[PDB]
């Protein structure tokens, strides 16, 4: 992540991020809504950071330092460029909604009142079809990526040295290769939980309550389609094992 956004999302909550004199001006229900919207954006910033560790630190470092056989780096990091493009664009929209809502003279005090429309847009039309295609592919290649990683780590000295080198710093403690793969697979199923809690505190404006209800339904439709589209790929699986599913 870039320092400007890390500092904007350093606090444990929106109520601790804004100035205390600005917090005091709002009703408790608004503070509760803003704290959950802040968690959605903060966790999206961290999810895009997970995808940058996968593309920049791991994938590109392996291409630039190691002599892996062709198709092996794509096997370890399936769909990572497409996932980065989807989430970096979505994060850009969330951060621009916050930036437009800042008070003049402040880089920290804002209230987002209209999140629902942004979520309906992300989870409908071509962007939703792209998210469905990409996660159905990624999640079907998840087991194969883990097995390929374990095989290379156990048998290739230069690969083991590379992994131990780039994952040594304390800031990578939660982000080894296998951990990044599962953080990405689990991201999509965090959205209903976050949207439902934002909706619980968004009844004050009926258009907002309706738009978040529509977004929640679209996200659950996407998840149902991805879940029905998954079949784990396995290296060396024979056609007979597949057609006898």
């Amino acid at each position: 992540s870039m320092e400007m956004d890390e500092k904007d999302f350093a606090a444990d909550s929106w109520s601790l991020a804004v100035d205390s004199s600005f917090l005091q001006q709002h009703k408790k229900e608004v503070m509760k809504q803003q704290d959950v919207i802040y968690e959605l954006i903060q966790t999206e910033l961290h999810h895009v950071r997970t995808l940058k560790i996968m593309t920049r630190l791991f994938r590109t470092g392996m291409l630039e330092e190691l002599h892996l056989e062709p198709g092996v780096v794509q096997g370890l990091f399936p769909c990572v460029d497409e996932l980065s493009d989807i989430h970096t664009r979505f994060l850009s929209q969330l951060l621009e909604r916050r930036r437009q809502a800042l008070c003049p003279g402040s880089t920290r005090n804002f209230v987002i009142h209209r999140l629902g429309d942004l979520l309906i847009s992300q989870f409908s039309g071509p962007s939703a079809e792209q998210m469905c295609k990409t996660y159905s592919e990624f999640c079907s290649r998840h087991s194969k990526a883990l097995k390929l990683y374990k095989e290379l780590y156990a048998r290739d000295k230069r690969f083991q040295q590379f992994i131990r080198k780039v994952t040594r710093p304390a800031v990578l403690k939660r982000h080894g290769v296998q951990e990044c793969i599962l953080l990405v697979t689990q991201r999509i199923t965090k959205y209903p939980l976050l949207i439902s809690r934002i909706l619980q505190h968004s009844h004050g404006i009926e258009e907002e309550r309706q738009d978040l209800t529509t977004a929640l339904g679209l996200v659950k439709e996407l998840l149902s389609n991805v879940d029905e589209g998954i079949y784990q790929l396995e290296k060396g699986a024979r056609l007979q094992e597949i057609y006898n599913r």
Binding site: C139, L182, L223
Partner: protein, 179 residues
């Protein structure tokens, strides 16, 4: 330190997310309780052995039977949770959660954990449950379920007061280290 993986499973109302949050912070949040848990790697020393214990939640995956099993590869210990204020969450343990974890995590120890133990003597909880002819889960009901499902053991905790939380994760670390 050796690296081990823990996964928590259980129904949506079981308190799994709150349990992971309270353990990873050593605190019940005073200002904002997070909605979700990403992951965490805890440094734990149990009985003189140092372990890096990676922690994972399955919250949000309960309705998605093809996404949820992607959380299980190479798990070393399972925490299987139910809430003491919900006999319904305990009823779903033996024939829904247990056959799934035994299939995807063969031979992995399961610790059955009764969450929200502070609600066993909460008057509001006892009144709401009595309307459905129910009562908070009794300790013997939790131990008998753990015994029946072949759990490594039975433990109780309260994420709200932190009572019992350190003990659950130290025991999960010991279970993960066993042959």
């Amino acid at each position: 330190a050796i690296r081990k993986k823990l996964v928590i499973v259980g129904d949506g109302a079981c308190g799994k997310t709150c349990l992971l949050i309270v353990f990873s912070k050593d605190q019940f949040p005073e200002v904002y309780v997070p909605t979700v848990f990403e992951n965490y790697v805890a440094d734990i020393e149990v009985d003189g052995k140092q372990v890096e214990l990676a922690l994972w939640d399955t919250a949000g995956q309960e309705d998605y039977d093809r996404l949820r099993p992607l959380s299980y590869p190479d798990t070393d210990v399972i925490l299987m949770c139910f809430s003491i204020d919900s006999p319904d969450s305990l009823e779903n343990i033996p024939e829904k959660w247990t056959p799934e974890v035994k299939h995807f995590c063969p031979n992995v120890p399961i610790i059955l954990v009764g969450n929200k133990k502070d609600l066993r003597n909460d008057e509001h909880t006892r009144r709401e449950l009595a309307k459905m002819k129910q009562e908070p889960v009794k300790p013997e009901e939790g131990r008998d379920m753990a015994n029946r499902i072949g759990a490594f053991g039975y433990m109780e905790c309260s994420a709200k007061t932190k009572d019992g939380v350190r003990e659950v994760f130290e025991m999960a670390t010991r279970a993960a280290l066993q042959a």
